[PDB]
Amino acid sequence: MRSSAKQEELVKAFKALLKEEKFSSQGEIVAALQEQGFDNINQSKVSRMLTKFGAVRTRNAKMEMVYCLPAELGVPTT
Numbered sequence: 001m002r003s004s005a006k007q008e009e010l011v012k013a014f015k016a017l018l019k020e021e022k023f024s025s026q027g028e029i030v031a032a033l034q035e036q037g038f039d040n041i042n043q044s045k046v047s048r049m050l051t052k053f054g055a056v057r058t059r060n061a062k063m064e065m066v067y068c069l070p071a072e073l074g075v076p077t078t
Contacts, residue, residue: 007040008076009037010033010040010049011074012076013033013036013038014049014053017032017033017036018053018067018068018069019068019069021058021061021066021067022066023066023067024064024065024066024067026043026050027043029067030042030043033046050067053073055067055068055069055070056070
C-alpha cells in the first residue's frame, strides 16, 4: 500500500519508444515523450538516457537509420 509517483515511467516509455524503431534522433524522442505525458524532458535528458541505457542507431525495415535498443540493458532500480 504505497502510491509514490516515482520516475519509473520515463524509463519504460524511453526503452519502449526506441524499441518501436521510429525515432531517428534525440530531439525526435524528446518531443515524443512530451506528447506521452512527460513535462520533465529535454535534449540533455534524452542524450543522457541514450548513453545511460546504451541505445544503438540501426537500419529498420525500410533502411532508415533510427534509434533502437539492444539486449536487456537498463533495468529499473535506481
